[PDB]
DNA sequence: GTTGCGGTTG
DNA sequence: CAACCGCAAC
């Protein structure tokens, strides 16, 4: 058929996950501009869980919406990932993306995105 | 792949395991909008379920855990001590095996843990 | 439920 | 400047 959908892709911590390119500064709640993607290198079975957590050296756990996806042909598509957790001035929450096989794996994604109440902001005066 | 080409040395070597090597402030982020009492119940029924998400506070690494090789006392150990469970949690992080090992206050639902390189793991991987 | 933008503040 | 708080307009 046609062929070509993970998108914008960037390595994760760790060697078996890539993951898809968030925005740097996002606003808090908010829908992503893209949808937050989960690719697995090595195989792995369709169906297995994937979550994604977020915390950094000031909000020590952020609390996400819809942060749990399925894999299907390599690929955990998330639908609607939120931050809704601030992560602090001049700060950006590391992921945890944890990949639910016997025993779970785990990728993290460090500085990964900054949240704020505002998001983005064009400077003003 | 799974794991990198040198477990042991990552493990010893980078910053990110060494923060987590020796036993720290970590704590239940499960539920975190729900009363206390409440988030002290889920916290045990999900325990007794082999699994939990707890964060190392200081630097806010957030992990999801299975206790498991229902758990077994060796995994998820109520008797050891009371007032706080013991676990364990075998896992590969950003490409290295390692096991979880902490403690939590049923109470206060917080506590010390730290990772502990798996060789054994990491031999069979 | 979403968004953009003014008032403020450190 | 870059946060936060608010909330009018849809």
Known sequence: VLADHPGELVRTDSPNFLCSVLPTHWRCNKTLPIAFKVVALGDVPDGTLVTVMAGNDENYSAELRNA?????????????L???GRSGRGKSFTLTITVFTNPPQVATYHRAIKITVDGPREPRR | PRVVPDQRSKFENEEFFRKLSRECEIKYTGFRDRPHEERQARFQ???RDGRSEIAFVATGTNLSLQFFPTPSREYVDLEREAGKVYLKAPMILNGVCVIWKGWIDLQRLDGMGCLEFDEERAQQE
Do not use: L, P, Y
Not at chain 1, 68 to 80: E, L, P, Y
């Open chain 1, 68 to 80: 749990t996806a399925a894999m299907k042909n390599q690929v955990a598509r998330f639908n609607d």
């Open chain 1, 82 to 84: 939120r931050f809704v």
């Open chain 2, 45 to 47: 029924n999900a325990c």
